[PDB]
Amino acid sequence: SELWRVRWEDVEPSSLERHLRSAGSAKTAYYKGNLVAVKRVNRKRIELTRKVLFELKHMRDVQNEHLTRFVGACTDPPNICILTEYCPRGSLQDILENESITLDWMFRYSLTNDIVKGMLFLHNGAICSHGNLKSSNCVVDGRFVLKITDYGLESFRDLDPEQGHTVYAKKLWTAPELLRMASPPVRGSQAGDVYSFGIILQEIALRSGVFHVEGLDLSPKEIIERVTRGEQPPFRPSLALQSHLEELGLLMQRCWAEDPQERPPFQQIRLTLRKFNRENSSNILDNLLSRMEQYANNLEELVEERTQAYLEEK
Amino acid sequence: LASELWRVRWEDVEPSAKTAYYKGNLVAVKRVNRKRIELTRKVLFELKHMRDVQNEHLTRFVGACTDPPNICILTEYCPRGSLQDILENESITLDWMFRYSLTNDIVKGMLFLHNGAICSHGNLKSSNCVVDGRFVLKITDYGLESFRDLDPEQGHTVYAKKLWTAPELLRMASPPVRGSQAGDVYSFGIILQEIALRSGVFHVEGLDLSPKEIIERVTRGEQPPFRPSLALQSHLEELGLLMQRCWAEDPQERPPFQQIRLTLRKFNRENSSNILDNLLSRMEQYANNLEELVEERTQAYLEE
Numbered sequence: 105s106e107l108w109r110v111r112w113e114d115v116e117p118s119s120l121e122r123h124l125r126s127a128g129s130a131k132t133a134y135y136k137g138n139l140v141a142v143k144r145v146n147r148k149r150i151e152l153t154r155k156v157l158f159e160l161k162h163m164r165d166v167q168n169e170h171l172t173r174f175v176g177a178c179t180d181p182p183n184i185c186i187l188t189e190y191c192p193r194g195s196l197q198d199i200l201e202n203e204s205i206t207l208d209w210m211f212r213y214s215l216t217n218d219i220v221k222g223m224l225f226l227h228n229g230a231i232c233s234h235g236n237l238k239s240s241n242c243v244v245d246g247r248f249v250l251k252i253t254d255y256g257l258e259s260f261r262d263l264d265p266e267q268g269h270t271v272y273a274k275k276l277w278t279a280p281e282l283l284r285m286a287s288p289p290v291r292g293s294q295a296g297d298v299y300s301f302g303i304i305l306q307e308i309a310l311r312s313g314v315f316h317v318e319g320l321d322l323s324p325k326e327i328i329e330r331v332t333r334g335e336q337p338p339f340r341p342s343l344a345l346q347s348h349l350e351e352l353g354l355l356m357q358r359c360w361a362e363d364p365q366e367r368p369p370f371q372q373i374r375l376t377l378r379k380f381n382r383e384n385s386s387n388i389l390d391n392l393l394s395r396m397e398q399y400a401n402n403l404e405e406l407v408e409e410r411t412q413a414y415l416e417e418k
Numbered sequence: 419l420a421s422e423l424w425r426v427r428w429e430d431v432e433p434s435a436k437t438a439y440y441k442g443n444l445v446a447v448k449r450v451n452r453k454r455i456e457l458t459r460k461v462l463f464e465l466k467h468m469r470d471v472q473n474e475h476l477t478r479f480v481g482a483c484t485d486p487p488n489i490c491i492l493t494e495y496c497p498r499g500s501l502q503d504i505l506e507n508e509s510i511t512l513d514w515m516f517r518y519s520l521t522n523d524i525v526k527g528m529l530f531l532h533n534g535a536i537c538s539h540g541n542l543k544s545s546n547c548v549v550d551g552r553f554v555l556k557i558t559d560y561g562l563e564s565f566r567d568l569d570p571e572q573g574h575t576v577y578a579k580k581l582w583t584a585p586e587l588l589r590m591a592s593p594p595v596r597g598s599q600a601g602d603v604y605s606f607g608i609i610l611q612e613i614a615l616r617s618g619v620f621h622v623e624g625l626d627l628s629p630k631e632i633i634e635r636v637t638r639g640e641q642p643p644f645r646p647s648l649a650l651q652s653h654l655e656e657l658g659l660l661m662q663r664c665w666a667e668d669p670q671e672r673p674p675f676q677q678i679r680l681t682l683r684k685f686n687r688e689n690s691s692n693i694l695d696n697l698l699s700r701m702e703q704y705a706n707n708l709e710e711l712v713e714e715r716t717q718a719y720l721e722e
């Protein structure tokens with residue numbers, strides 16, 4: 105018994121149209137814990153071998169502060185999904201999808217540090233790599249401890265060849281090597297992880313949406329066709345206009361490269377992060393507290409502003 | 419005495435319910451209508467103590483104006499609103515655990531203030547202790563016996579600003595500014611009532627009473643131990659009972675703050691969660707309430 109197979113009979117279809125993403129204009133549930141989340145898998149059958157069993161065991165094994173611990177991936181004949189601990193406050197894509205929120209560069213450094221330190225453990229032991237890394241697949245938590253979602257998944261994955269064009273639509277994350285071939289391994293390469301952080305770091309670095317060029321926007325299909333094609337002048341987004349941020353941009357430049365030869369390792373990555381931290385802090389909980397306090401300040405300003413504005417408008 | 423680490427002398431203190439700044443520090447200043455101040459060895463030691471005392475739950479002094487044009491005490495500002503003020507809005511969605519936890523902090527702070535270099539603060543009006551960024555229940559009116567307005571001719575205006583005061587300290591006698599230990603117990607009792615009911619000061623169940631009338635009934639010396647009525651319920655008669663015990667007229671049996679710590683610890687056996695991690699926890703509930711409020715109200719008024 106792997107104590108990882110929740111039987112559908114007991115768990116309840118608990119749902120509510122609560123603040124799913126609490127941003128001004130998933131299947132969040134619960135089971136004998138706190139808010140649980142489901143990640144359905146269209147398998148219709150799974151003959152998990154002892155390799156698969158060890159996969160699930162390892163999935164549970166890595167109990168870490170920056171990981172969304174899995175509990176049970178039900179194997180119902182008519183249903184299957186991964187019951188992952190839900191965390192409110194939405195995703196990081198949601199984290200900035202509300203232009204109202206006013207995070208300014210310190211939050212950004214802290215988030216980058218959190219994700220780097222998370223990934224470090226993420227690919228040394230108990231899981232080689234996930235390969236689905238993305239900005240919008242690592243959501244914030246109640247106390248802004250970033251986690252990582254839908255990793256591992258030896259067999260639970262949307263493997264079936266389907267919707268190649270929407271495959272373009274979401275595939276912008278992955279490395280050019282991923283599109284270079286016809287079947288990259290589901291477990292991405294360590295180089296894949298590095299470059300995927302590069303893409304996410306683009307996302308966090310510049311407030312704008314995913315991967316926008318200067319005066320240039322070509323749709324997902326065409327842009328993915330180009331990036332797979334490859335150009336001697338390679339395609340990528342400009343770091344930023346901030347005159348004091350060339351080091352984050354250069355880090356990303358080193359991150360995505362034509363060949364994995366000089367793709368820097370996350371060890372050097374965190375080295376540069378500590379260098380650019382300018383000795384901000386040397387405390388563990390103080391950073392959490394500052395994050396929370398300034399978040400509350402932003403919410404205070406938002407509520408005052410909009411409430412007063414529309415009330416007087418009335 | 420010659421240390422001179424108390425009086426900035428207001429050379430260029432940064433300007434800005436009347437908040438200003440000092441060397442980048444966003445400080446608050448309150449004046450004192452006393453255009454006769456001079457040297458005071460006793461006041462000197464008082465300032466020394468006010469400058470060399472600190473603690474987690476208690477605030478701290480910044481500067482003093484020794485100039486004839488302006489005399490004031492300047493302390494560190496705190497973002498979040500005044501305790502009485504913050505809850506009197508009635509639309510911040512506070513609850514039970516945050517409730518007892520807010521209570522306990524002022525208990526610790528006053529306990530530690532009681533037996534320091536300056537005796538327990540007497541003028542501990544429940545609406546003169548405020549809260550900082552991370553909800554660290556603070557205190558003000560920190561001693562400074564000679565830095566207080568002594569004007570006794572306000573009269574009815576005085577009756578506006580004198581409600582918590584101890585009847586033993588209001589029995590038509592010249593008030594000792596520092597107050598009394600029983601005074602501190604009394605003030606804490608009233609403040610606990612305010613937290614329990616969250617409707618102001620001496621909230622009367624089904625009655626009206628002007629502040630002058632309220633003071634008149636305090637001074638009535640009525641054989642019944644009149645008090646604002648503890649909220650009739652069944653969740654906790656213990657808190658109301660402690661308020662009653664700290665309410666009686668006779669100072670002697672009014673338990674001191676250490677037995678009050680014992681009682682509040684008994685009350686808090688329920689949670690006993692953590693020391694500083696729970697301090698993080700409280701801001702989670704606060705932020706959840708804020709987010710709910712802003713999202714729902716904004717959605718409604720966008721519809722309208």
Ligand SMILES: Nc1ncnc2c1ncn2[C@@H]1O[C@H](COP(=O)(O)OP(=O)(O)OP(=O)(O)O)[C@@H](O)[C@H]1O
Binds near residue numbers: 143195
């Ligand atoms: N902790 C969480 N667990 C599950 N879903 C979450 C969590 N936090 C946020 N979400 C929501 O789940 C969404 C799913 O993101 P993703 O890009 O993975 O799409 P998805 O449907 O989960 O894809 P897949 O199911 O293959 O992972 C997030 O965009 C967010 O809206």
Ligand SMILES: Nc1ncnc2c1ncn2[C@@H]1O[C@H](COP(=O)(O)OP(=O)(O)OP(=O)(O)O)[C@@H](O)[C@H]1O
Binds near residue numbers: 546558559
């Ligand atoms: N950290 C702080 N330091 C000084 N004042 C503060 C602080 N936080 C809030 N305040 C504000 O200071 C004001 C004090 O009001 P006021 O001066 O009328 O009374 P007080 O003299 O402070 O005390 P009392 O009510 O006993 O007279 C409050 O309205 C409160 O909003």
